[PDB]
Design a protein around this ligand. Structure first.
Ligand SMILES: *[C@@H]1O[C@H](CO)[C@@H](O)[C@H](O)[C@H]1NC(C)=O
Ligand SMILES: *[C@@H]1O[C@H](CO)[C@@H](O)[C@H](O)[C@H]1NC(C)=O
Ligand SMILES: *[C@@H]1O[C@H](CO)[C@@H](O)[C@H](O)[C@H]1NC(C)=O
Ligand SMILES: *[C@@H]1O[C@H](CO)[C@@H](O)[C@H](O)[C@H]1NC(C)=O
Ligand SMILES: *[C@@H]1O[C@H](CO)[C@@H](O)[C@H](O)[C@H]1NC(C)=O
Ligand SMILES: *[C@@H]1O[C@H](CO)[C@@H](O)[C@H](O)[C@H]1NC(C)=O
Lengths: 48, 37, 206, 326, 48, 48
C-alpha cells in the first residue's frame, strides 16, 4: 500500500474525487518506481 | 584525429553552457598527451 | 445555392505554433489537435447545400482574389433555441456575436431573420489557411497567408481566443472553391531552427 | 581563513597533506529593479460585489476585466464575507502578480450547494447549471444574503435547472426553456423564506478566474517600476518573473505574440521589457570552485588556493564583504 | 425527521439493509451545511 | 514537476505562502536527490 488507502487504482478512483485520487495515486507511483529501480540495479550488479 | 572528444575541462571564460550553469563540471587529467607520448 | 465536392490529399500541411514561447535550434515533442499528415481532405466548388458538421475544430483553406468569402456561422440547431455564433468580416474588421439567431437556410451576404440574447459583441496566388478550435468555452483561431495542396511547411500564428460558452457541432460558410479538413488529437515532433521558426515536423503515429 | 574552512569541512582540528575541494565562490548582486507596465485606471470591482440584483445560477452573469490596476485588498470593504477560497494561489499574494485578464462570474445559490463550486464535484448545480475545470486557478467568494433575497411570503425570482439530457462542460451555459422529454418543466424556482434554516437560505457567489501570464499582461498589482540597469549582476522582477543575473542587449527575433524564451531545462533566457519592448538576454553571475592546498597542519599553516576553471585576470577582486560568498 | 433525539450516553442505533439508498435526498430533511466523511467522498456516495 | 504545481522555485515562492511553499518544495528536493543518486550509482558501476 505504501501508505495509501488501497493497493488498487480502481478502488481509489471509485471512492474519492479526482483531487484526492491524485494524492492517493502518487504514493503508489513512487513505491512501484522504487521497486523497479532496485530490481534494475541488482540486475546490473549481477551482470558484471 | 579519428576519435573526437567534447572537452578536457580547460578554461571556459550549446550543451556545455547549460551543464556549467547547473553545477556540473569536468576536470582535466593529470598527465597531458605529450607525457604519454 | 449549388455545391459539388471532390477529394484530395494534404502533403504535410496545417502545422501551427502551440505556445507563445521562443525556442531556437531544438526538437520539441508536443501533443494537441493537429491535422494528420496525408489526410483525405474535401474540395468544394460553389455555384449559384446543407450545414457542414463540426466534429472538433476544423482546417480551412482558400485561394481567392478578393473578399468573396466573408464569414461563418456555428451552432447546433441554429433555428430559435440554441445560441449560435456569427462571425462576419469584410475589410479586416470582424463582427462576432453569440445570439439566438434564426438563420435563413442557404444564407448569403448581399443571413439571419432575428436574434435574441446576444450578450456578446466584438469588433476588430495567396493561400489563406485557418484553424478553428473550441475547447472548454474557449473558441480559438489560428491563421496564415502563404504566397504560392503544395508541399513544404508553413506555420500558423494565433489571432484571438474568446469565451462563448456554447456547444458547437455544426458550422456553415457565408460568402467559390475551398478545401476543408478535420483535426484530431495526436503527438508531433517539431524542429526549431536558428530563427525560432519551425522548419520540419514528424507525425508520431503515422 | 581557508585553512579554517578546510578544518570545518573535515570536521576535525587536524588536516593532513593533500589538496581538498573546499567550497564554491559566487558573485553577489548589487541592486534591485522592478519593471511593470505603465497604467493608471483602477479595476471596477465596486460594480460586481455591490450590485442591486444577482443573476440566476442557470444563467450566470460574466464580466471581463482588463487593462486596469488591481487592488484586491479593497474587496473586503464591499461584501460581508468571511474569507476567500483560492485554488492555485494564496489570497495574500494577489497584489504581487500580473495576469492577462480576469473573469468575474456572479450568481445566487442555496446554502448547502456552495460546496459544489469547487473542482471535481457533482450534483445538480455542478452538472446542469455551473461547472468548473478539474485544474482550476482562481478564487471563490460566497456570503449570506438572507436580508436581501428573502421575502416573508416567498421569493420565486431565482431559478435552477433540474433535468438535462447530458451534463455540462467547464464554463458552459444553456438558457433554453424546451419542455423536457410524463413531461416536466426543466427549471424550478427556489422557495426562499426568512424562517428557513441556515442551510436553506440564499447565498450570493462570485468567482474570480485568472490567466497565469502566458502573454503580455493588462492587469497588474499596485507596484512601482524602477530604472533599468543592464550590465551589472542584479535582482530583477519582470511582471512577476523574479530572478538574479546579468542583463544584456539581445539580437533574438521575437514575434509580436512572444514574451520570453526558455532553455532546454525550461529556464528563462530572454525577456521582453514591458515598457520599451526590447529583447534582453539573461545570464548567471560569476561562479566557481575553490580548492585548498596544504602541507599538513603538523608541519605548517601556509596554504595555497586554486580557483578551478577561471582566468587569472578575471578572478574576483572586490574587497567588500558583501560581494563574494567566501 | 425524528421529533426527538436520544441523549449521548444512550445513543440511538438504527440498521439499514436490503434497500436502494439515494443520498441526494437527505439534503432536504435537515438544514445542515455539509457532510464530514472519512474514507470516502460524498459526491461518489451514489456509485457504491 | 514530480507532482508539484510547477518546476520553477521562483513561481512557487511568488504564488504561495511559506507554509505551502515548503510543501511544494519538498517534492522537488526529493526528485532532484533521486536523480543525482541514480547518476552516481551508474557512474560507480561503469568505473568498475
Ligand atoms: C477519400 O474519401 C473519398 C470519399 O468517398 C473516398 O471515395 C476515397 O477513396 C478516399 N481516399 C482517397 C485517396 O480519395
Ligand atoms: C535567420 O535570419 C537571417 C536573416 O534573415 C538569415 O541570414 C539566416 O540564414 C536565418 N537562419 C537560418 C537558419 O536560415
Ligand atoms: C453600494 O452602493 C450603494 C449605492 O451607491 C451605496 O449606497 C452603498 O453604500 C454601497 N455599499 C457599500 C458597502 O459601499
Ligand atoms: C506606457 O505604455 C507601454 C507600457 O505599458 C509602453 O508603450 C511605454 O512604457 C509607455 N508608453 C509610451 C512611453 O508611449
Ligand atoms: C585570459 O584573458 C585574456 C584576455 O584577452 C586572454 O588573453 C588570455 O588568453 C586568457 N587566459 C587564457 C589561459 O587563455
Ligand atoms: C418532516 O419534518 C418537517 C419539518 O420541516 C415536518 O413538517 C414534517 O411533518 C416531517 N415529516 C413527517 C412525515 O411528519
Amino acid at each position: 500500500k505504501f501508505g495509501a488507502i488501497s493497493s488498487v487504482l480502481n478502488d481509489i478512483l471509485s471512492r474519492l474525487d479526482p483531487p484526492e485520487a491524485e494524492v492517493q495515486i502518487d504514493r503508489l507511483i513512487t513505491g512501484r518506481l522504487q521497486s523497479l529501480q532496485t530490481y534494475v540495479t541488482q540486475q546490473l550488479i549481477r551482470a558484471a | 584525429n579519428k576519435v573526437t572528444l567534447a572537452d578536457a575541462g580547460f578554461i571556459k571564460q550549446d550543451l556545455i553552457c547549460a551543464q556549467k550553469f547547473n553545477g556540473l563540471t569536468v576536470l582535466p587529467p593529470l598527465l597531458t598527451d605529450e607525457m604519454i607520448a | 445555392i449549388t455545391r459539388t465536392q471532390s477529394y484530395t490529399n494534404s502533403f504535410t500541411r496545417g502545422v501551427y505554433y502551440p505556445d507563445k514561447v521562443f525556442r531556437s535550434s531544438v526538437l520539441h515533442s508536443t501533443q494537441d489537435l493537429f491535422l494528420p499528415f496525408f489526410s483525405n481532405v474535401t474540395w468544394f466548388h460553389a455555384i449559384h447545400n446543407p450545414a457542414l458538421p463540426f466534429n472538433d475544430g476544423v482546417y480551412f483553406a482558400s485561394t481567392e482574389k478578393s473578399n468573396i468569402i466573408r464569414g461563418w456561422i456555428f451552432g447546433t440547431t441554429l433555428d430559435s433555441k440554441t445560441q449560435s455564433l456569427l462571425i462576419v468580416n469584410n475589410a479586416t474588421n470582424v463582427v462576432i456575436k453569440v445570439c439566438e439567431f434564426q438563420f435563413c437556410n442557404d444564407p448569403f451576404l448581399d443571413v439571419y431573420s432575428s436574434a435574441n440574447n446576444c450578450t456578446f459583441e466584438y469588433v476588430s496566388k495567396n493561400l489563406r489557411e485557418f484553424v478553428f478550435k473550441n475547447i472548454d468555452g474557449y473558441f480559438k483561431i489560428y491563421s496564415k497567408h502563404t504566397p504560392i495542396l503544395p508541399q513544404g511547411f508553413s506555420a500558423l500564428e494565433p489571432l484571438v481566443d474568446l469565451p462563448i460558452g456554447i456547444n458547437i457541432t455544426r458550422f456553415q460558410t457565408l460568402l467559390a472553391a475551398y478545401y476543408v479538413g478535420y483535426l484530431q488529437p495526436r503527438t508531433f515532433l517539431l524542429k526549431y531552427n536558428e530563427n525560432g521558426t519551425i522548419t520540419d515536423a514528424v507525425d508520431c503515429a503515422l | 581563513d581557508p585553512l579554517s574552512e578546510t578544518k570545518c569541512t573535515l570536521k576535525s582540528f587536524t588536516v593532513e597533506k593533500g589538496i581538498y575541494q573546499t567550497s564554491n565562490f559566487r558573485v553577489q548582486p548589487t541592486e534591485s529593479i522592478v519593471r511593470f507596465p505603465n497604467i493608471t485606471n483602477l479595476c471596477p470591482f465596486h460594480e460586481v460585489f455591490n450590485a442591486t440584483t444577482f443573476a440566476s445560477v442557470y444563467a450566470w452573469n460574466r464580466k471581463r476585466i482588463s487593462n486596469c490596476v488591481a487592488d484586491y485588498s479593497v474587496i473586503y470593504n464591499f461584501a460581508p464575507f468571511f474569507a476567500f477560497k483560492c485554488y492555485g494561489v494564496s489570497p495574500t499574494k494577489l497584489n504581487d502578480l500580473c495576469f492577462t485578464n480576469v473573469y468575474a462570474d456572479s450568481f445566487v445559490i442555496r446554502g448547502n450547494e456552495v460546496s459544489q463550486i469547487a473542482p471535481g464535484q457533482t450534483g445538480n448545480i455542478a452538472d446542469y447549471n455551473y461547472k468548473l475545470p478539474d485544474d482550476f486557478t482562481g478564487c471563490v467568494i460566497a456570503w449570506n444574503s438572507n436580508k436581501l433575497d428573502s421575502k416573508p411570503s416567498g421569493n420565486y425570482n431565482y431559478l435552477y435547472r433540474l433535468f438535462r439530457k447530458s451534463k455540462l462542460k467547464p464554463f458552459e451555459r444553456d438558457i433554453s426553456t424546451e419542455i423536457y422529454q410524463n413531461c416536466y418543466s426543466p427549471l424550478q424556482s427556489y422557495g426562499f423564506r426568512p424562517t428557513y434554516g441556515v442551510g436553506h437560505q440564499p447565498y450570493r457567489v462570485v468567482v474570480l478566474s485568472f490567466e497565469l501570464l502566458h502573454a503580455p499582461a493588462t492587469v497588474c498589482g499596485p507596484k512601482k517600476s524602477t530604472n533599468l540597469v543592464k550590465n551589472k549582476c542584479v535582482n530583477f522582477n519582470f511582471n512577476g518573473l523574479t530572478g538574479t543575473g546579468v542583463l544584456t542587449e539581445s539580437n533574438k527575433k521575437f514575434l509580436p505574440f512572444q514574451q520570453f524564451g526558455r532553455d532546454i531545462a525550461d529556464t528563462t533566457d530572454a525577456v521582453r521589457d514591458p515598457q520599451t519592448l526590447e529583447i534582453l538576454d539573461i545570464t548567471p553571475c560569476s561562479f566557481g570552485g575553490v580548492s585548498v592546498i596544504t602541507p599538513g597542519t603538523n608541519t605548517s599553516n601556509q596554504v595555497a588556493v586554486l580557483y578551478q576553471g577561471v582566468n587569472c585576470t578575471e578572478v574576483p577582486v572586490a574587497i567588500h564583504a558583501d560581494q563574494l560568498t567566501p
